[PDB]
Symmetry: C3
C-alpha cells in the first residue's frame, strides 16, 4: 500500500525533474537564438543603410518572407 504510493510519487518526481530539465535546456537555446536573430537583423539593417537601399530592400524582404511563410 504505502510502497505502491511511494513508488508512484517517485515516478511523478522523476518525470517532473527530467522534463523540466529538458525544457530549461531548450529554453536556453531559444533565448540565445532570439538574441542572435536580433543581432543579425540589426547588422543586415545597417548594411542596407550603408548601401542606401533600405526602403526597397525592406519591401522586397517583407513580401518574400511572407511568401515563404505562406
Amino acid at each position: 500500500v504505502k510502497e505502491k504510493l511511494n513508488g508512484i510519487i517517485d515516478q511523478i518526481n522523476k518525470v517532473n525533474l527530467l522534463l523540466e530539465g529538458e525544457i530549461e535546456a531548450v529554453r536556453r537555446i531559444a533565448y540565445m537564438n532570439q538574441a542572435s536573430s536580433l543581432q543579425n537583423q540589426v547588422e543586415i539593417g545597417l548594411i542596407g543603410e550603408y548601401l542606401n537601399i533600405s526602403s526597397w530592400l525592406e519591401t522586397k524582404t517583407l513580401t518574400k518572407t511572407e511568401e515563404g511563410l505562406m
Copy 2:
C-alpha cells in the same frame, strides 16, 4: 486512502499544467525565431543579389557555416 490518491492526482495535474505552460512559452519563442531567421536569410540573400556576388558568397557561406557546426 481516498485522500492520498486525490493528493497524488492533484500533483500530476500540477506537473502537467506547469510544464505544458513552460513548453508553450518556449514554443512561441521558437516559432518567432524561425520567422526571424527566414526573414534575415531573405534579406541577406537580396543584398547578395544587389551586390551581384550571390554565388560566391553562398559557397563561402555554406562551407564556413558547416565548419562552424563542425
Copy 3:
C-alpha cells in the same frame, strides 16, 4: 484499489509521453534555428568583409543590439 493505482500510473505515462513529444518537437525547431542564425551571421559577416566595413559595422551592430536587448 489496484485499478485506481493502475489508472493513475497510466495518466503519468500519458503526461510523460505527450510532453516529451512536444519538447522534442520544440527542440528540433530550436536546433534548426541555431543553425540558421549561425549561417546568417556568417553570410552577413562575409558581406561586411566584401564591403570592407567590417570593424565599424560590428561596433554599430553590437551596441544597437545590446540596446535592443536593453
